[PDB]
Structure 1
Amino acid sequence: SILDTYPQICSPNALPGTPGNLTKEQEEALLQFRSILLEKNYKERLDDSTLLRFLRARKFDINASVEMFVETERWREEYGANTIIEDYENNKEAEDKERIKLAKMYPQYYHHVDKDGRPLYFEELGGINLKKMYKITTEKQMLRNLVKEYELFATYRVPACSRRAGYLIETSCTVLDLKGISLSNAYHVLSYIKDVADISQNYYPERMGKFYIIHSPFGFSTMFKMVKPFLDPVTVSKIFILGSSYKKELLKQIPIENLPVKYGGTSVLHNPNDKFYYSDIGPWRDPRYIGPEGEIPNIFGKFTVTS
């Protein structure tokens, strides 16, 4: 299968319970977990990486992991996550135009990788005007866009980055820039954040590698306490709200050459006139690391900056 075309073993320097770094009891639990799912007639997504993500999400409690997997398979089918990429490619023009309309006001882009080879994802929220934003998109539409990105990440970004790093990469490094937002709006979008967390926590286990929140407004940490009840403590332990020294802090995790100049690095686009909010630069754009899955589609249509 496609999995035979890229490393399925994590770096030996990874956390416990990850592919290739299992204890004897974890190996036995994985074998039992798969056996149960197969006997329940499941066939897809039974690979070590996928199954270990669920097992880690439930501390290797096999029955709890079976419940989580069973419910996820249900959701993927009811929500259409299994055909989200195909459906997109069958109505690409219309969908591309929508993303282009929102790109400048709500930058969302991947730009290279972190020191461990994880896709580096950036979001800028300071230019968002809710009134204007909801004239172009709906809340559910934004949620579906995020789910589509989750699928593109697993389908195209994971394989390319794993082949580049020489080992399995299953998580991302995220940087949320809140420069320009008001504490007020942060509280006002809590319901959306809750929807994102619900889908992400329950159906996309162990996908978070690093998560930084920068340029947050005074009092944001207090506002964040409202979000914690929607997140597991493991997830919370991977989210870091940085202050004035964030530039140096980011450089501990990301190569300076990969980090955009405005965030403390020296990274620039081949064409100085291009915009980061139309870019999608990374290993998934390198012929050497693109496999049988094919190259990722250009989410910003003709405006997509791939270099």
Structure 2
Amino acid sequence: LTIEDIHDVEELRAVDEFRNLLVSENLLPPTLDDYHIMLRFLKARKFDIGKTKLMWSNMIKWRKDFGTDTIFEDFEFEEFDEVLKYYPHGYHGVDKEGRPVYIERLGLVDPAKLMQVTTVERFIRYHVREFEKTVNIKLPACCIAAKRHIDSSTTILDVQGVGFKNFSKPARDLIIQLQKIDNDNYPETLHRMFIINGGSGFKLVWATVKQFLDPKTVTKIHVIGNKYQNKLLEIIDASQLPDFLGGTCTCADRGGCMRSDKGPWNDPEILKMLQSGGPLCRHNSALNS
């Protein structure tokens, strides 16, 4: 199967020069020997080979110390159904460019009930296990469905009713911790973010959070008030957008859009193409031979 994957000659050179540096210092596990993973790290440090190597070796040590390589089999997150009741979030369909759409209903987060049913450390380990599923299953499924290389998501954060007066220091610190793990270990995986239903109460929440965010991440974020539905329908087809966000989707047979995990990673023919299929990238295939 032929997937649209344009490589720039200048990027092909830089990534191979980075790969040769990693091999010569035994910093390249075969699991991470992928043109596109290395390209994301190089982009995160503006193709500075020395800063990217330091970022890379920090990530290798992090995967070792965290237990990231074995998290699917090791981490049984038994409180998942209770957590999801007090923090509604999920992937739901694809945007018009084939990227997965990730939604969080932050207006419906119950922080007190959430700390009754999990811990911050367990929630973060669940975040890492879901990220591993996103980069190994969900993004490659989107590559197949669109016949195009995809490795980043469109995020919608619904912040209805969220105001600065109820924006707590533990809420801030979780955002910091989640972003630190994402920026260190999953770089360049956010394409864009739409923050919707922001009230006048939200202006100081966004002010204070931007002080802690990677400034490249800030440039990918759009904060919208109550009139958001047409902006989401411009970039996401109505069939892929839940009806509560202005689309047609109800996922009624699966108990609703925030629980269905709807997307091409649920299709058995696409998942067979991942397990059976030869590499999604021609440069990896040519390095192998």
TM range (shorter): 0.7 to 0.9
Gaps of 5+ in 2: 276-289
Q: Does 1:159 align with 2:140?
A: yes
Q: Does 1:84 align with 2:71?
A: yes
2:132 and 2:238 mapped to 1: Cα distance?
28
Q: Secondary structure at the match of 1:180?
A: coil
CA RMSD of aligned residues (A): 1.9
User: In the alignment, residue 121 of structure 1 is paired with which amino acid?
Assistant: Y
The CA deviation at 1:269 is 1.4
Q: How many residues align?
A: 272
Query: Which of 59-68 and 37-46 deviates more?
Result: 37-46
The CA deviation at 1:226 is 2.1
User: In the alignment, residue 266 of structure 1 is paired with which amino acid?
Assistant: T
User: In the alignment, residue 10 of structure 2 is paired with which amino acid?
Assistant: E
Q: Secondary structure at the match of 1:220?
A: helix
Query: Which of 97-106 and 252-261 deviates more?
Result: 97-106
- On the 8 A contact 1:221/1:241 being kept in 2, the answer is no
1:162 and 1:292 mapped to 2: Cα distance?
11
- On the 8 A contact 1:57/1:206 being kept in 2, the answer is yes
Q: Secondary structure at the match of 1:205?
A: coil
Q: Secondary structure at the match of 2:17?
A: helix
Per-residue Cα deviation, 1:83-111 (whole angstroms, up to 9, x for no partner): 111213xx4xxx2x411112222111111
Q: Does 1:104 align with 2:85?
A: yes
User: In the alignment, residue 109 of structure 2 is paired with which amino acid?
Assistant: I
Q: Secondary structure at the match of 1:170?
A: coil
The equivalent of 1:26 in structure 2 is: 11
The CA deviation at 1:292 is 6.4
The CA deviation at 1:232 is 2.1
The CA deviation at 1:231 is 2.3
User: In the alignment, residue 123 of structure 1 is paired with which amino acid?
Assistant: E
Q: 1:231 aligns with which of 200, 205, 213?
A: 213
Q: 2:261 aligns with which of 265, 280, 300?
A: 280
Q: Comparing both structures, which one devotes a greater share of its residues to helix? A: 2
- On the 8 A contact 1:259/1:267 being kept in 2, the answer is yes
Q: Does 1:143 align with 2:143?
A: no
The CA deviation at 1:164 is 0.6
The CA deviation at 1:6 is 8.5
1:197 and 1:6 mapped to 2: Cα distance?
34
User: In the alignment, residue 155 of structure 1 is paired with which amino acid?
Assistant: N
Q: Does 1:35 align with 2:30?
A: no
The equivalent of 2:36 in structure 1 is: 49
Instruction: Calculate the TM-score normalised by the size of structure 2.
Output: 0.88
The equivalent of 1:242 in structure 2 is: 224
Gaps of 5+ in 1: 11-19, 295-307
- On the 8 A contact 1:6/1:159 being kept in 2, the answer is no
1:43 and 1:147 mapped to 2: Cα distance?
19
Identity of aligned residues (%): 35
- On the 8 A contact 2:140/2:151 being kept in 1, the answer is no
Cα distance 1:127–1:6, how it changes in 2: closer, same or farther (>3 A)? farther
The CA deviation at 1:150 is 0.6
Per-residue Cα deviation, 1:227-277 (whole angstroms, up to 9, x for no partner): 223322211111111123211111121111111111111112152x81333
Cα distance 1:145–1:6, how it changes in 2: closer, same or farther (>3 A)? farther
Per-residue Cα deviation, 1:105-161 (whole angstroms, up to 9, x for no partner): 211111111111111111112222222211111111111111111101011101211
Q: Secondary structure at the match of 2:68?
A: coil
2:25 and 2:248 mapped to 1: Cα distance?
52
1:270 and 1:278 mapped to 2: Cα distance?
10
User: In the alignment, residue 29 of structure 1 is paired with which amino acid?
Assistant: A
- On the 8 A contact 1:126/1:178 being kept in 2, the answer is yes
Q: 2:50 aligns with which of 37, 52, 63?
A: 63
2:222 and 2:152 mapped to 1: Cα distance?
16
Q: 2:61 aligns with which of 66, 70, 74?
A: 74
User: In the alignment, residue 209 of structure 2 is paired with which amino acid?
Assistant: V
Q: Does 1:260 align with 2:242?
A: yes
1:151 and 1:228 mapped to 2: Cα distance?
26
The CA deviation at 1:279 is 1.6
